[PDB]
Structure formats: structure tokens, C-alpha cells
Subunit: 387 residues, 4 copies
């Protein structure tokens, strides 16, 4: 009953299931997990792949023999489980050397060290088999108005991203970059807060075909925006390379709950938008199990994310495959929305007398749009109570 | 004492001072104002120009003789006061024919009527002397997830904006377009909610040099974002053609208070950013006086906006012209932020041994950034208590 | 299929279905409705009763003959439909004489006029058969910090509510009062913003057994709080006399959507809390149909509110009547939450050695709470996918 | 220049200046501070006293000899500095045994252990000389709707607070209790989120004269409410026993910035309300220095909190002592707000013909309130630009 399979492209993170529960008012409630154990339990649950930070796989300040031993043990775990790695990311936020930032720091040697650590993790990501890179700007911001010059910081972020694009062009890899936006937490105001700010940063670079977005449901719900509107703008731009699925209960701190929890209707319209657009990337869950749970609660939340995605996929397919719903879609003129406005020309629009001169504004205004009947049909197909 | 002058480019709107106080739980508390009286009182207060909707100047469904009589009376008022018109906008939100939207509606004749009304107001705006056009997407959105298809709606908005750009290219005018973002109110989720979403829409058009943004302090503070960060990203893109100044007390409804009220520190850093960048456009106040006030309170709020801008301009100039502040700026390494990261090359960065191999992360992490001393100097220069 | 009946106590408002669609950026999209027509269509839909403002039933400044003609026509409509009136409220927000407030105004004659209008509407409410009175503080607040003295305003609100309690004690009626909280809109900061602020105001009055709360789902979701937590605190205090059900999509303006839309999981836990506590009052829907809809969309939204309540009542009863859910409730120690902490005494708690001295904090901390398995069971019972 | 003195009652916390900078995306950036060193540096800065958690002073699981050695060293530091202890609090949130909660937990032995730890810290607080106790409900809440029964949890919180009141009544101490509200972080929905919810909990207890509130500026600004409105309701109830002063930049995570930063106008009206009401308690700063700062930045922020309070005290006294401001206060009818509404009686109000019959609503509605001129006078007295 709603059993996940590796053909559904369900991927998880190592920091998701390996989170020890350290919130800033409490200590850790769970022990540290082996990545081999995490890969084997995610293979028993039915996932497709795992993602990793560099500090999640290899600990900080270790030797090259311990680095290649960790890479060999992780490669033996992936070869015995059959799982892939579709995405990797870097850690530029945990260490106190990155307390002002990574690529946009006030120290040039800290900026060069973050670039060198990023280039080493890109080499490890291509060596492990990833095809998407994610650069989350965690510490890139300020707590006051005079702590960062924002135009110079966008110049240094453009210089660092063009250096990474020049490095992958010179090595000839097939990896592509993704930018993960967030409005705040841990900084007061994180640079590029939204998907649109990330896309406007992407269209100013030198090689803009290698950069996309990695949006998050929770990170766009802390700004109070609409996540199907952001995903549909990113798909209209053709730049959605990766996605992150979690839950959020409104404008607050980053909770990172399981998928389906929080805004269930927005998750339903997100799953309906991805199934109607045909997004063929990985389905990544960047979530956190709560610190009141044990490891059985961790794997129960990891099963519940995939179960909620399969239930919402079945409800969205049953919503879109219905003749009464298609009659309500024809009654709400959404097929006339798909028609072009003026395909006859600008001179034909200026010479058409029925657009301004004989247009009846009262007869066009006394026409119901019937959106509430379609929304009640969507609510009945979501809850399963159809007559 | 802080007397405004027309060289300071202070502009207002007709709907700002002519607001009758109709909120959705109450009736109107003031009578309708004459635009001639509004232009003469704003000339006595010391403004530079006025802006207008088409429905603010000429009422709906009137004749051409009453239209040219209103244009002749407004032109006689501008010729006797000496004020200009730097900006005009259209009204696609008040009438019930635009209850689904203007350029992105589900009715093709409503879309063509909104385009024809926009072209007629562009002809009136060039005839009156404006050089910036503002298209605010007021009703462009939905209250449910299935009421709009967002990719087709962005296709129709791209088609309508390319038709307006083709019209001003064919007539050969010197006017430029501006897009005013808003997250919500009156719709549940308004398309292009932020400045970054507007810039990402601007970089997908066919002639992108004629389109910019018209951001608002309140409209970016209902999303919980940072308005100097948005204005600095719009100035880094080179697309800030117009601005709107008001106040807002957090994530709530659109209050549209006077300038200085609300986030005083964010208004101070906004005035400091505009004075350091040298923005030479109009200083427009899109504000609303409250409905508890009379007309003396309306002109007191209109004087208080310009007085708050001149006081914040003096405090920002006294903040930037100070040797102890410049010593704190050198101590916070913001001159090293202005230096480039790797101007020696990618191969020089990969061969530089001091970036990764002999980089001391503990000695680079045990260095204070001293942002709080600079923020206390900014607070002392804001409040005037300097020792 | 989920047909409503008058035994389910479903009540509506006259201003709900009679809303003409006047938002503050647009005009009215619908004509004015007859209250006789609204009562007859709500009787055909299956409601139990209607509520009214005084200005919704009798227009402002009319004669006593037109007042008794409107009362006679409304009484003939109620006698031919069989519907009741369980609740009435007053209008102290639409007229421009109440632009500073009603009971807490800066004018003593305006305060006395609001008290006299409230006493006349209480006499009409007892004459029509209501048993609950609602006093919504619409305009009771300020836009600046120096426009109201808040302690003197709470003194005048206490004086006005004690005068209304003295009036209903002197007339000997059986009506009870309810206070409806709201954080903002139309004022910047409305006095008594939450249910807890209303309860803390209720416990300072002279006759506190005649005052309760009338909370709203949307009005507590504009503050970002938890509405089952507020309803459970109001039921723990024993003061929940009335309720208002609508929808809201987060911290924004007051949308007043239909029930079920917005936070569906919070609506599910609200319906589960009311069905487990046994709240026997009216089920009132203070909602607004959108201005894109016609009258068929208005009655479709009015049917969809009752259909969503009956579907959530069936899902909450199927959630609570389940042995696997009861086993998860026993595993999550919520039966041990219902046990008292120290029923043996304070000296027995201080002399009990197993509370502090031999208490094993590691063995008590290494115990999973299993909340995620219970929340997945609640999500499966909400969506109907149970194996 | 604005030098603080111990007669101004400026108090700090040990966890404020001893915060190591551990946010949930990063590690610690500073070493652990000695409390003797913190008391001596706060005495050199000019504070009046220090507050403490029990885990801040004595570490967890230590012996009684190390406990009395820490108490003897802290007592020698207080005797050599001359500083007091006005307030103490307990730690029921850091350890993983309190991951579900303290007083409202699902485990009875965890509830009894939290009560015994609270009684031991009350004995240490009376032994050190404190007169106010603060019980912050950090972990008292849930992440889902079925994880806590809220009425049973309020019953157990009432039982635990009545047990603490019975303990201080039986020992005969002069200490009083304070409840610190917070909406969320670290839980999803913390029980008693606001000051009004805490006051409504206080008025249900058995001995309600020993319980008050300890509100925070940031904790009431994460709910989007008005903190002078909450402090004025707590002073109208007569229950403000303690206060916490910090800063917050809107509805987000708990930043805990320095005082004056964030909402400067709301901090100005808060300082004006405390100086006009005559609050004679301690002025406590529950703030966090940022992790980019060193120890000189920590003591610079600790000096800047007291400097911002003294500057706002001088500006509020200069605002209230002004004849033009008093003329605007008489013009805005705030002396008529202080007059009672109906001191002649209910029968005199019902027989007064000038309240309803000869009341001119148009002449009372065509009267300006002149709030914007008073708010401009308050802005000019805040910024110091007075003519
Ligand atoms: Co997240
Ligand atoms: Co993520
Ligand atoms: Co606005
Ligand atoms: Co504007
Ligand atoms: Co409402
Ligand atoms: Co209501
Ligand atoms: Co705090
Ligand atoms: Co605190």
C-alpha cells in the first residue's frame, strides 16, 4: 500500500536522517549515525539515492588516508546497496572561520579558502558520480545595515560563481550548479532571499546556462510567498534543476518538517504542478525529524515523506483525470487563458473596434468566474469524498 | 528649518492626497479633492511634481469634451504652478471588469480592453510630459491553486509587455516602463511578488532595456524582506528607474503610512544607500493619510514626509562624513570587501599554497568583526547623541 | 451525500452572503441582497439560523415605521422558514462618526452614542430571540504610539461593558456577551488582540459570569498563533460561548475564506477538539465569498462550508474510533498526561527519593515519544488512505 | 556622556554575556566565560545586578562540594563588586530529559524531577538574595495537533504552579513568581504564547497575588503584536513584576539583539510608558551578542544597551515636558479620554436626550483628530530636530 520504488527517484540527505537534534536551546538527543547504516536503511526503506555535505562524509581536519578510507567505505556501501548520488553540496556555515560568510566575506583569504574547499568538493562530487551541485548561501548576509556593502558582495559572489564555472569548463565536467535561497536564519537578512532574486542573479553571470535554482517549500514559506507560483516561474524560466521538499507552519523559524505536514493544499498543488509539467529530476527531502523521536521515528518520518508524495500523486492524477473537473475548467475559461491575446498584430489590435469602442464593460463584468466550485472539486478530490 | 525645495525632486500622487478614507470596514471620511487644488497646495508645500492614474484625472465613461476639459484644466494648473509630471500609471483594478485581472485575465476581450486602455493612457502620459510609466499588477493572481495557470499567465504578461514595447518603439517615444511588485492584497497571491521576481521577468522579454522596477518600502516589508537589499540588487542590475516611499509596521496589510514612520532604521539605511549610489530619479511618496485626519492633517503628513527625508539625508551625510566612523569601517574590513577575490587567475588560485594548505583556520576564526561598534556609531549618528 | 440538517446547528451571517465585494482597491461586483431572500436560500441550503448587524437589517437614519416594517418582514421570513436567530451584533465601525472608536473614543458624546446604539440593538436582539451578544472592537486602537492612552482606554471599555451588564441585569434578560478579538485591520493595533487578552479583560470586570469570547480562525491566524490551543484555553477557562469559522492562508490581511480552505490540518484538529469537548453552541461561518463569483458561487461556498465541516467531523470520528490509534495514544503516554503529577502531597514529593536522588536522567532521556507515527496515522485518517 | 549608574537598576544575565555563539547551523565562536569575570566586567561597565540559571552557575551532575565552592566564589565576587541578584530562573530546556517539557510532560517522573529541581533552585535563589522568580516555559508545547492534550497540560501546569506557591507559602519566603511567554522556537506552538494568555492563566490559580508576567520585546514581536499595548495591559492588571529588553526585526526567529536595535519607535514608546507609569523594578537585558564579535564587542553591546536606554529616557522626558506637545495633546482630546464616560448613571444615560436623539453625527464626524501632527512632534523629539 503506496510502496515506494527506486523508479520514483526518491532521494534523501545524510544530514536529514543523521541529525542529532541540536536546536539552540537544547543538547543532542540522538547518537551520531554511520553513513553506511544510513545508506543501508534508506535502501531497505526504498529510496533511490543519497546526498551529502563534505563535512557529513569526511570530518574536519582529517588525514588523506582517513579521507580515502571514508570514500572507500561509502563507495562499498553504494555498490552493495545499488543507490546513486545525484547531488552534492558543500559546508560553508558550521565552522567559525565562516562566521561572516563564505564567498562574500570581508576577508580575502577566507574567500579564497572557501573557493578552494568548494573546488575540492566539486572534484569529490564528480568522482562519486553527482550531476548537480548545490551552493547554499548560509552565512551570506548581515545583522545590521552597515555590516555589508551589498553591491560589492554581489560582485564577489558573481566573481566566485564565474570562477567555479570557469573551473568546470576547464575540467570539462557535466555537473551543473544550483543556488538554494533562504530569507534569514542564521543571519538577519540572507543575500538572494527568494527564487526570483536567485534567478535575477543567474541572468547577470557570464555563462548562465550552467546555473539554476534549488528551492525549498519551507524556505519560501518563511517569506510568506506561494511555492507553486515560485516553482512555476522557475519552470517558465527553464531553470529548475533540483528541488527540496519539507513542511512549514507559517512565517516562523525553519522547522524542516516532513512532507505533507504544514500546508497540505500547497503541497497538493505543488505535486500537481510537478506531475503536469513533467519534472524529471530527483525528489529530495531536506527535512528534520524532531528531537523527541528515536531512530524508529526517524525511519517512520522517512517512510511518511514518500507515502505522502505517493498519496498526493494519486489524488492529483485523479483530480486531473475527471470529466466534471474538465467541465469546470472549461467553465472557468482556463482554456481561453491558454489562447494568445493578440496573435493578429498590434495594428489589428489598434484597428479592432470591439476591443475599446463597442466593448460592453457591464456585460463583461456581470459574468461569474466559478472558481469556488472548482476549488470545492479540488478539495473533494483531495479528501477523497467524491459523489 | 528643513524646508523642501523643487531641486530635491519631491513628487506626490493624486490618489495619495485625494484619498477619501474608504477602508473595507468603513465609509469615506473626507470629500473628493480637486486636482487643481491638490497641485496648488502641493506647490505651496514645496513639491516638484505630481503623478496620476487615468481614472484619478478623467472619470470613467465620460465624453471626449469633458476629457479635454479636464486635461486643459490640469495643464493650466501645471502652467500656473510650474510643477512637472515625471510619472503616470494606469487603473486596472477599480472597475469590476478587472476582477480577475488586466493583462493576465481568463477573458481575451478583457485582456484586449486592458491593452487598449493602457495604450490610450500612454498617449496621454507622453502628451502631458511623463518619462516613466508604471504598470502595477493589482489584480494579477488567484485565491486558489487551480484558478490560474501561472506559466500561461506569465506568457500572456510577456505578450502584453512586448506589445507595449512594440507600441512605444513604433511611435518612437522616450518613455520607459516600470513594474511595481506586491505579494498580496487584494488577491491572495499576486504574480511577481518581489523585486527579484520582477527582475527575472524583465530578463525574459525581447527588448529588456526599456523595463525596470518601481519598488515600495511597504510592499517589500509585507514580505518580510530587506528593502536596502532589494534596492541594492536593483541598482546592481542597473534597473532602478523609479521608487515609492512609505511606511509599514511589519508583516500585515498594506498600511501606506508616511515616510519615516515604521522602520526608521531601514528608512535611514535606504536614504544612505540612495545618497551613496547617487539615484537621480524622482522621490515619490505613495502614502495614505489616515481617515481620522482632516485636510490639515493631510498636508501635515505631506510636509512630514519631505521633512523626514531631509532629516535622514542630513543624518546619513553626517554619518558618512566622520573620521571615527571611517576608522571603524577600516576596522570592519569593508575596504577589503571592495577588493576582488582572485584577480591573479584560476590557475594562480589553484597553485596558491596559502589559500588551503598553510591557511590557519583558528587564527582566522579568532578575529572579531566589530560590527556592533559600527552599529552603535550609526545609532548615535541617527539619534544625534555624539560625544 | 454529507447533506446538512438543522440539528447540526449551522448558522450564517447576513453580511457574509450579502457582501457586495467592496475591497479597498475595487468597487462592488454584486447587487445588494434581500434578507428575506437570504433567509429563504439559507433555509433551502439547510442552515439552522442567521445572525445580523443592526445596520444589515435596518439602514442608517431611517424612520421607526420603516424600522418596524423591516422587523415585520424579517419576522415573517423567519416564521415561514422556521429558522432561528441565535446571535446578534452591533455596527460600530462603518460610519465616519466611529473613526476613532466606539466604546474607547476620545469624544464622550461619541462614547455615549455608541452605548445608546448598543442598548437599542440589545433590545432588538432580545425582541427577535437571540441569546448571545457579540461586541467586536473594530475601531478600538491607534496607528501611532501617542494617539491612545491604553490604560484609560481599558478603563473606558471596562466602564462601558459594566454599563451593558448593569443594563441586562436591570432588565432581567437571559442574553450573554461575547468579545471578538482581532490583532489589526482596519486599525494598526487593535486593543485586546488575542483570546487570552480578551480573557484577561474578562477577569477584571465586576460581573464576570456574563462575558465570554467569540474567537475566529482567521483572526487568530493573522497573529500566527494556534487556534486549537486558543479554543482549548477558552474551554479550560469555561468561557467559549460562540465561535466563528473561516479560512486564512497565513500572516496577511483578513481574507475570510470558506471553511476547510487555508489550514486544513488545523481545521481538522479544531473539529476534533470541538467534537471531543462537546461544544453545544452554534456553528457560525463568518466568511466572505470572493468578488469574482456570482450568487451561484455564493451559495456554492455556503454549501461547501457545511460539507467541509461534515467531512472533517466524519474523519475526526473515524480517527478517534480506532484501536491502532488508541495503541499509539497509549504508546505516546497521553493517558499518563491525564494522570495528576503529585496527588500524594508536597511533603510526599519532597520526601520521595525517586524524584531527584535515584532518578535516572539518561534512561528517561533515551525514550522515544513516537509522535510522528501518531501524526502519520492522523494524516492517513485525514486523507482516507488507511491500510 | 550618558554614563550608567547603579541607581538606574540596570541588570544583565549570565547567559547573555556568556553566550558562546552556538546557533543551530554553526559551532561556538567564543570560549566559556567565568561568572566572576562577568560580574567584575559588568561592575566596571556600571550595572546593578546579575541574573542566573542554575545550570549557568553550577554545572550539571556535579558534587555538593563543587556546588558550594561555586556558590562561595560567586558570593565572594558579589561581595567584592557590590552587585545584587534581583532575579533567578531555572533551566528546564537544555537537557534531553526535558525534550517533551518540564511541568507539562507526558512522564510523571520527569514532571516530579522538574518540580524538585525547581524547588532546589528556589532555595538557592532565596539563599543568594533574589526576590523574583522566573519560570520560562521553553519546551512546553507540541509540533503536531495530537501530541499534547492542551486542557490536561494546563491542568498539570496549574498543579505545578500551585505546588510551588504552596512551597513558598509553607517556607514563608518573600519571593514572587513570573511567567515568561513565547509563541514558538524551540517547539512549534509553545503553551501560553502571549502576555494575555499568561494573565488568563494567572487568574485561574488558587493564590493569584504571587504570580505575574516577565514579558520580552522580541518574544512579543515574533507574534506581531504591540509591546507597549501588552505592557500597558499588564500594568492595568497590576501584574508587571519584571521585564526583559532586547530587539527584534519582525516576525522571524528569536534574534535577541541589543536594545534600541530593531523597532526604535516602539522602544521609544516603551521607555515613555515605563517612565510615565513609574515602574520601579529591574531593567533586565535578555540579549545575545552576535557570533561575529569578540569579547570587546560583547562589552560594547552591553554598554550600548544602557546608553540606548538613557538616550531614550532623555528623549521621552523632553517629549513629555513640552508646551507645544501639551497643546497638541489637548487638541487630540486625550484629556477627554481620561474623563469617565457615564459618571451620572445608567438611568441618566438612558434619559439623556443629547446622546442619541439630538446627537449630530455629521458634525461629530467632520472633526479632525490631529494625530499626525502629534506623531510628527514625537518623531522630531525622537530625532532631536526641534525648531
Ligand atoms: Co529548511
Ligand atoms: Co535545503
Ligand atoms: Co502600498
Ligand atoms: Co506604489
Ligand atoms: Co475575519
Ligand atoms: Co467574526
Ligand atoms: Co528572546
Ligand atoms: Co527572556
Amino acid at each position: 500500500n503506496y510502496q515506494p520504488t527506486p523508479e520514483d527517484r526518491f532521494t534523501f540527505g545524510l544530514w536529514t536522517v543523521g541529525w542529532q537534534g541540536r536546536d539552540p536551546f537544547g543538547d543532542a538527543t540522538r547518537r551520531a549515525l554511520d553513513p553506511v547504516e544510513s545508506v543501508r536503511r534508506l535502501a531497505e526503506l526504498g529510496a533511490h539515492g543519497v546526498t551529502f555535505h563534505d563535512d557529513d562524509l569526511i570530518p574536519f581536519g582529517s588525514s588523506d588516508s582517513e579521507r580515502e578510507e571514508h570514500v572507500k567505505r561509502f563507495r562499498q556501501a553504494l555498490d552493495d546497496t545499488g543507490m546513486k548520488v545525484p547531488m552534492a553540496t558543500t559546508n560553508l556555515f558550521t565552522h567559525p572561520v565562516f562566521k561572516d560568510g563564505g564567498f562574500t566575506a570581508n576577508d580575502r583569504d577566507v574567500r579564497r579558502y572557501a573557493l578552494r574547499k568548494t573546488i575540492r568538493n566539486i572534484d569529490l562530487a564528480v568522482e562519486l558520480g553527482a550531476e548537480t551541485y548545490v551552493a547554499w548561501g548560509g552565512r551570506e548576509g548581515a545583522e545590521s545595515g552597515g555590516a555589508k556593502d551589498v553591491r560589492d558582495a554581489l560582485d564577489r559572489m558573481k566573481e566566485a560563481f564565474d570562477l567555479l564555472g570557469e573551473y568546470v569548463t576547464s575540467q570539462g565536467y557535466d555537473i551543473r550548479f544550483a543556488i538554494e535561497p533562504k530569507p534569514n536564519e542564521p543571519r538577519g537578512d540572507i543575500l538572494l532571499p527568494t527564487v526570483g532574486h536567485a534567478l535575477a542573479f543567474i541572468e547577470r553571470l557570464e555563462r548562465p546556462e550552467l546555473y539554476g535554482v534549488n528551492p525549498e517549500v519551507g524556505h519560501e514559506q518563511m517569506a510568506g510567498l506561494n511555492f507553486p507560483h515560485g516553482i512555476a516561474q522557475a519552470l517558465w524560466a527553464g531553470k529548475l534543476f533540483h528541488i527540496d521538499l519539507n513542511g512549514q507552519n507559517g512565517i516562523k523559524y525553519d522547522q524542516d518538517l516532513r512532507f505533507g505536514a504544514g500546508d497540505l493544499r500547497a503541497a497538493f498543488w505543488l505535486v500537481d504542478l510537478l506531475e503536469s509539467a513533467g519534472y524529471s529530476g530527483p525528489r529530495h527531502f531536506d527535512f528534520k525529524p524532531p528531537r523527541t523521536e528515536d531512530f524508529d521515528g526517524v525511519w517512520a518520518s522517512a517512510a511518511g515523506c514518500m507515502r505522502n508524495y505517493l498519496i498526493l500523486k494519486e489524488r492529483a492524477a485523479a483530480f486531473r483525470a475527471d470529466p466534471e473537473v474538465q467541465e469546470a475548467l472549461r467553465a472557468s475559461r482556463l482554456d481561453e487563458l491558454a489562447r494568445p491575446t493578440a496573435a493578429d498584430g498590434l495594428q489589428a489590435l489598434l484597428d479592432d473596434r470591439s476591443a475599446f469602442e463597442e466593448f460592453d464593460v457591464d456585460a463583461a463584468a456581470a459574468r461569474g468566474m466559478a472558481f469556488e466550485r472548482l476549488d470545492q472539486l479540488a478539495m473533494d478530490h483531495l479528501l477523497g469524498a467524491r459523489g
